[PDB]
Write a protein that binds this ligand. Structure first.
Ligand SMILES: COc1cc2c(cn1)N(C)C(=O)[C@@H](NC(=O)c1nc3n(n1)[C@H](c1ccccc1)CC3)CC2
Length: 265
């Protein structure tokens, strides 16, 4: 359940926050300025609906702060940051854990798709990791928070394409689908084993967009550490140019869970 929390609930732009009674949380204040009270109940219900997406692999929206001219969202604190932070830490992550993170991403995405939620911005920054290396899927760019996103863009307030299905590059009139997210997943799979972002040799945005739409993909030979052949096959399957040929997350799960259990766990 969501709390209509108050600024007063916290000790004296994104920022750490210590709730006076509940503890560490993440706050994004989305808006400062004129009153716009007419938006209040829609902002609250939208937060309620996002808060109703509950699953072990989906991040919890803990509270909102709705005040005279200050609107803030409050999220649970994931101790190890996002997945790229984890992949780029000095201490390595063993193959078993990488396999589990993949399985858990599949579960969160199957759950979301089960509820009719198309993420549209899946990427390592939206995959958060707790102290025990379990993951939760987040929506930090507010791609599913329609009203808060508009609130964030209002005039009187005070981006990466690596993971975008090629159908959406240079085409803002295509509607994203579940297969859009599957493509993103494919590139996340590559990042997990490369321990870095793809396309490091790309020079210009227009060169990248045109290259990916012509069929360029992340360089599989650039994976130095060991990567199971089945996982190389999965990412190639998941980033096929034809969206209708990419599998669903339930189809992915039925393949990868028995492979995870028998080979990587
Ligand atoms: C650093 O930038 C950000 C951006 C934000 C935040 C922290 N750092 N805070 C404080 C949040 O609360 C974020 N919330 C989410 O991303 C969020 N909340 C939920 N989800 N994501 C879940 C979800 C996941 C995927 C799709 C839809 C909903 C349901 C609850 C959105 C705004």
């Amino acid at each position: 359940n969501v709390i209509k929390m108050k600024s007063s609930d916290f000790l004296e732009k994104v920022s750490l926050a210590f709730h006076r009674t509940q503890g560490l949380m993440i706050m994004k204040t989305v808006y400062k300025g004129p009153n716009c009270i007419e938006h209040n109940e829609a902002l609250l219900e939208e937060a309620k609906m996002m808060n109703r997406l509950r699953h072990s692999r989906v991040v919890k929206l803990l509270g909102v702060i709705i005040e005279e001219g200050k609107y803030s969202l409050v999220m649970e604190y994931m101790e190890k940051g996002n997945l790229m932070h984890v992949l780029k830490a000095e201490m390595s992550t063993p193959l078993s854990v990488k396999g589990r993170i993949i399985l858990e991403i599949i579960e969160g995405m199957a759950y979301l798709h089960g509820k009719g939620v198309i993420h549209k911005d899946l990427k390592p920054e939206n995959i958060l990791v707790d102290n025990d290396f379990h993951i939760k899927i987040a929506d930090l760019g507010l791609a599913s928070f329609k009203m808060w996103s508009k609130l964030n863009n209002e005039e009187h307030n005070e981006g990466t394409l690596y993971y975008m299905a090629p159908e959406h590059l240079n085409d803002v009139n295509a509607k994203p689908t579940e297969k859009s997210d599957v493509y993103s997943f494919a590139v996340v799979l590559w990042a997990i084993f490369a321990n870095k972002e793809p396309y490091e040799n790309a020079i210009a945005e227009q060169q990248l967009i045109m290259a990916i739409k012509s069929g360029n993909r992340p360089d599989v030979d650039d994976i130095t550490e060991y990567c199971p052949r089945e996982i190389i096959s999965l990412m190639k399957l998941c980033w096929e140019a034809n969206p209708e040929a990419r599998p669903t997350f339930p189809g992915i799960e039925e393949k990868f869970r028995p492979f995870y259990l028998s080979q990587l766990e």
